[PDB]
Amino acid sequence: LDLFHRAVFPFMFLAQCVAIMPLVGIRESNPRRVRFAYKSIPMFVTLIFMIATSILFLSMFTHLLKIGITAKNFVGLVFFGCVLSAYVVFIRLAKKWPAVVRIWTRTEIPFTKPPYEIPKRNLSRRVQLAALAIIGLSLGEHALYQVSAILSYTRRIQMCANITTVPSFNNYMQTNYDYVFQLLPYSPIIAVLILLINGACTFVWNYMDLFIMMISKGLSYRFEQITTRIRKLEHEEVCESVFIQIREHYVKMCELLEFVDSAMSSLILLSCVNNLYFVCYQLLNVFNKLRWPINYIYFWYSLLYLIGRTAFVFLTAADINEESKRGLGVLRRVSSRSWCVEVERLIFQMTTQTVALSGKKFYFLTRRLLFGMAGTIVTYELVLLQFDEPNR
Amino acid sequence: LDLFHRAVFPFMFLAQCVAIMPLVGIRESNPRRVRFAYKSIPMFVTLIFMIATSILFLSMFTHLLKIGITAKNFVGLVFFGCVLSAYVVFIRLAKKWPAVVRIWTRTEIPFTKPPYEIPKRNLSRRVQLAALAIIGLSLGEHALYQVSAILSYTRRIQMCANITTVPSFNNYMQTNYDYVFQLLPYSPIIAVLILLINGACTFVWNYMDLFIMMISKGLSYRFEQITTRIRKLEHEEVCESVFIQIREHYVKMCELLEFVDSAMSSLILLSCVNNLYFVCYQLLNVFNKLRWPINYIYFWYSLLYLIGRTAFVFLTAADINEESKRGLGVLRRVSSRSWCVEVERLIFQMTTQTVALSGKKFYFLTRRLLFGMAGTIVTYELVLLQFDEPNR
Amino acid sequence: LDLFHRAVFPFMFLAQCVAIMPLVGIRESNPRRVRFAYKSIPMFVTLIFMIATSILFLSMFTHLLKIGITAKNFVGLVFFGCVLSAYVVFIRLAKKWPAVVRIWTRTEIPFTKPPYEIPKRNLSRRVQLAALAIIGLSLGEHALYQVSAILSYTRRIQMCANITTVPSFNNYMQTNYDYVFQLLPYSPIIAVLILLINGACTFVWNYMDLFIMMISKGLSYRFEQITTRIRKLEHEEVCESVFIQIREHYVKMCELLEFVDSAMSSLILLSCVNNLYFVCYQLLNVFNKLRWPINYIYFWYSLLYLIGRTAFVFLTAADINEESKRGLGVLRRVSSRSWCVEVERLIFQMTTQTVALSGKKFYFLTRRLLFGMAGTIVTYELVLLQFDEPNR
Amino acid sequence: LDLFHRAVFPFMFLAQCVAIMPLVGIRESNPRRVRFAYKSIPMFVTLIFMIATSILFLSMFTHLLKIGITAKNFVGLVFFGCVLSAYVVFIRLAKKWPAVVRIWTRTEIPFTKPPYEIPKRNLSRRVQLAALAIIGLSLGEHALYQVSAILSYTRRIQMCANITTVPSFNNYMQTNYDYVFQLLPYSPIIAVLILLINGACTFVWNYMDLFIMMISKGLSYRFEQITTRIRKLEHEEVCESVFIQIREHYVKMCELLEFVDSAMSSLILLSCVNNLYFVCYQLLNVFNKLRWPINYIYFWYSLLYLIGRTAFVFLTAADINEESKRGLGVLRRVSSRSWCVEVERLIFQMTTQTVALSGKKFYFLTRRLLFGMAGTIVTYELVLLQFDEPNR
């Protein structure tokens, strides 16, 4: 059936494979069989992944202490700490996830029955499209990163170095992927597993935004179903019972949104802060020159993908607010004689109450917030180009 | 009759002559005969104009690559890309324009009948005044640009160059209007058509704002008619039927505004971003010195015209919001016994719902927004004068 | 009687003596005898004062052109242009002032009758206190300016100049009050009248804010009377007629506020822009050193007086909003059985409608606006100290 | 019983011992026996403490005049002036405190009776936890400050000075605690009392925020009791009398909040300004280097404690707003047939009226305000790092 759990679990399982949101029974179609247990195989795999990412973080910290902590090299520590924070926040989210899934299944039951109808693109297809787009873009970004790494390595070896170095996979690992073998003894297995850990770190960084997108789409699906139900009575006379049902379903959707926001406030805050910091860093670094054209294509692809992913997360989150507001226009056109207390309550609720995901209530994810964030980014970049100027 | 189509089509036809909003039957007084067809003479003329503007853009890009992309010379690429984006956005707007015109004619029918009355300046005269002012100011700006070009050319030739150059139209085209003849062979016909293309580019840049102004005036006309209808019952006892009619007409006007905003969101966003960028650029360039007094007059006229055009676009767009709010003051004075549910609904709708054009819902074009934009411009200029300081 | 005209005309007459708001019959106690006529003795005196101030402005412009227009010496042109703009705006305000006074007298009639009561400080005493404080502070500022001028002159003559200059009033006028005698022939009468013109310019600069303060106090007086009337029924059962009367009086006060705001939008905008510019200029200049202690005391007194006058104008204007909001708290405590449609309308009106003076609707003069302006001033000063740093 | 006075007086007495909020009978359990009398032993002790702090302030001012007032050394004058302002504001607060305590006891009486119930952590335990955490953190900060002082003294004496100085308590007082013995003759009693005065100054600086936290917790306690009472009727049919009682209690709580805000506006403004200034100063100073690791730990502990204390004050104040808003979600789920005028009034009151502490109405202490303050701090730091850059 068209349920959020059945539409989200195919990618929740892949995140479990990348050790995110440790749970048992996440592959089962029954939403009541998923539970969080500290003694589980997914718990052990995510514990191993956390240990590996922490080893990466300590190696980066040691390297930066040896070299010197600046505003440029600190981005590695920020990225690794953000991955660790994502791991911890996802552990807590998986702890809270049984109740979240249960309430999501309970409140979404009436939305699978008439007069609500499935749109041209059901929740499964929407989540699949969003997740496939995000996964493909992240895989392409990592592919261009690796390709640029190998190519910069080869052009750094074949000329501009007077040779004196046999091109090998070992030297690749010890040079491009240094600062980790200084603490650990070298081994091809060790190097390949470090590669897998870095890939999983990038995948977790992308999956934070992917999970936010999927949750926002799941909420906007039901909100759009409610909006379509309201629209389907545009030129027809509506009884008080229909308005009572619409108001009750809207109230239940608001309750579910509040519960999901309380559960995901930490994840939303972490994702927003991380995305803002990395967008500012990349916009600061946009003006420098790169040694090879492949580096230019990779860097511009990465910057465009990061900006687009942040904007798409914000727009998908604001889709909830826009969908809740869209019913107001149709409700404002209700005929005079078919106007009752229920319609007044519903209109007051949509007009006055803000209905959107929030970063621990500090801000509400809306299109207004996206425009304000864009302006703040512009101002921060204008200020930081003063710092950037003496370098060039 | 006093219709928006009959008041806007004289300038829509001129934009068609400058290859903007490609449509057929735009000169006919019947709003139902205008349609968008990809195989049409206006489509061919706008395709030629797009090809010419793209040739201009590629020539500018090649010249800037040869010289070097900085923050100063990039304004040419921004202008040409904005012209291209205006062409594309106007193509999509003309695609959506049949439905927009149809709904505009349908909802505005009751506003040509009593108790609504034509003001001292009908929609035709208002649109004519706005369009004539904009066209005359743009023609004057281009006239002073050309006059400053010829004069700077002559004073650059007659002294400060030791002659060694015969004053000719060919050298004018190859020197002031360079960077295009490097890719294309020289020809007087080629030079004159490039001149016409540049003039059309400037006219399109101005006509984006002109079209926004005309649409805003068309909406504010009906909103002011509604406001006057509300005012005409200040000290008279009003039945529920009159309030029902006023609320229904206000709701229909809000529907039309929402439809027009959905159609014109791309145009509004492009115009706002372009105007903000060019205003910031000109305010950054205001402090430098110019070689001749005619250059000073031309530059100050251009800066004043750009600032005034942006402010006038924003004020004309905010006129919709102000006109919708103006009826609240009269409605708040409704007598106690003649207060019903319809008046309460109408007051709640005007007070709570924001009624204005939006840039894809990211911001609402209001006087508050104009003041905020002025403050943002002041802050951006204060930051960018740090960059400007080392030059002088 | 306690009327705004009878409480404001003693200072309106003094402004007439300083050639501000040209009117006839402004000294008469009848509000219907004041009218604006272009052929009048006050019109002639204000025309002479405008000619003199324009002569001052042209002399300053010529001096700055001879020396060089910078960001430091431009403050004189800004001050003189602000005085000229104040003259023109006050001419238009006096043109509109007959209707403003008539409507003010008409709507304020019920406020001089029960159940409204005169507070411990009537409107006459409040306006007198505000005007006397402003006039005394401005006279003290001018007195310290003149004292610092004479003292800096004497210490510049008696030492640090090797004498070679006989101390005289003529040399004072030609040195401290230069840039005006370069265009006009010297004469003791000419010098003394230029002194009087400068004093009148300073008095007009202060009287703009003084007039805004007086208007704000006049409106807040009636709003506080309404608030006290609402408060006087805290623990008593209120009939619908009393609430009808309160709502009607509040609506009439809102109408009067809207009319006064429409009349005084230009004055409010000019005063706010001028005060912001001068506050920013003085906060930029606060860090430099002064040659003598008397100069330090004068400059700090001037800066403190300017900041306090701007803050007091903003607070007096926001007193209208605070007074309108203060009745909401008492109305929210109305007993359940004595709650009717009138109370609901009144509460909705005060809660939703903003009730304050506006700068042509671009912003509303509230305490929130004062805090935002303080933050904007802090940001602007932080940015401009970058410009100020290389000087020291 | 669970009363605010009985839960706050144990720490009010300690503040009295540190000479804050001078009152008599503050240790008595009866809220009506506390009164402010200018002729009292606590008045004499706080007068002595004010004289001592003023002596400290004058000594700091003399030292800075001898050395030179910069943006770095001025922090001592800011701290001492903030302590003096805290003393004066707390004197006025103790003057107003009889009425505040009386109204707090009067309005909180119904909250100690059914259907209101004591939560798992009563007001006494909440206030005790908050005050103990603040006192322990401040004592730890002072302990690390003193430890860093002694250690920096010893390492400055034992090496890097070529000895030539016998390590003694007298030299400690004359070197680390200089600028005060230049005006006063040296004495071990004088030095130890100056130490006690500095400790009391730090304790007053922390107790301003502590008192704000305690007041915010006291208000949020009753607001959370009201929210729980509203929640306890989620799936039960509610009569009009229960809603009348809930609305009346909410109105009384709003009245108490308004009274407390009027009494504590000066304290809130002073605390917010002081915290903002010191947070900006510390974030500006975060990038410099420190001579010893103990200095690093002390400075980072102080910065983290200051940031956390400011954030916790703001969050505790915003807890009132969040608690008032939390009842809206439950009230929005009231069944259709059990919806009456009282519920509509209550929902309108919570939705439209902002319910939070304010800094003299210039701003409202909410989570939105905390996020805005964080953004403002980020912007100010970005601007001020321009000033900080030439030092390093």
Author numbering:
A (entry chain D), B (entry chain C), C (entry chain B), D (entry chain A): 56 to 447
Question: What do the authors say?
Answer:
While mammals use G protein-coupled receptors (GPCRs) for sweet and bitter tastant perception, insects such as fruit flies use a unique family of proteins called gustatory receptors (Grs). To unravel the overall structure of these receptors and their unique structure features that define sugar specificity, we determined the cryo-electron microscopy (cryo-EM) structures of Drosophila mojavensis Gr43a (DmoGr43a) (given its better biochemical behavior than Drosophila melanogaster Gr43a (DmGr43a)) and Drosophila melanogaster Gr64a (DmGr64a) in apo or sugar-bound states. As expected, both DmoGr43a and DmGr64a form tetramer, and are topologically similar to each other, and to Orco from Apocrypta bakeri and odorant receptor 5 from Machilis hrabei (MhOR5)11. The structures of DmoGr43a and DmGr64a can be separated into a TMD with 28 transmembranes (TMs) in total (7 TMs in each subunit, numbered as S1–S7), and an intracellular domain (ICD) containing an “anchor domain”, following the nomenclature of Orco/MhOR510,11.
For DmGr64a, among tested sugars, several sugars including fructose, trehalose, sucrose and maltose were able to activate DmGr64a in our calcium imaging experiments, whereas glucose and arabinose could not. Structure of DmGr64a is more expanded than that of DmoGr43a, particularly in the transmembrane domain (TMD), which appears to partially account for the differences in their sugar specificity. The sugar binding pocket is surrounded by S1–S6 in the TMD of each subunit in both proteins, with the one for DmGr64a being much larger, consistent with a wider sugar spectrum observed in DmGr64a. Larger sugar binding pocket in DmGr64a results from splaying of extracellular half of the helical bundle (S1–S6) that harbors the binding site. Among these helices, the extracellular halves of S1, S3, and S4 undergo the most dramatic outward tilting in DmGr64a when compared with DmoGr43a. Lined by S7 that spans both ICD (S7a) and TMD (S7b), a continuous ion conduction pathway in the 4-fold symmetry axis runs all the way through both DmoGr43a and DmGr64a, and are all in the non-conductive state. In both proteins, two patches of constrictions are formed along the ion conduction pathway, one near the extracellular entrance (Ile 418 and Phe 422 for DmoGr43a, and Val 438 and Gln 441 for DmGr64a) and the other in the anchor domain in ICD (Leu 386 for DmoGr43a, and Glu 399 and Phe 403 for DmGr64a). Intriguingly, the narrowest point at the extracellular entrance is formed by completely different sets of residues in DmoGr43a and DmGr64a, e.g., bulky, hydrophobic phenylalanine in DmoGr43a vs smaller, hydrophilic glutamine in DmGr64a. When the apo and sugar-bound structures of DmoGr43a and DmGr64a were aligned, notable conformational changes could be revealed, mainly tilting of TM helices responsible for sugar binding towards bound sugars.
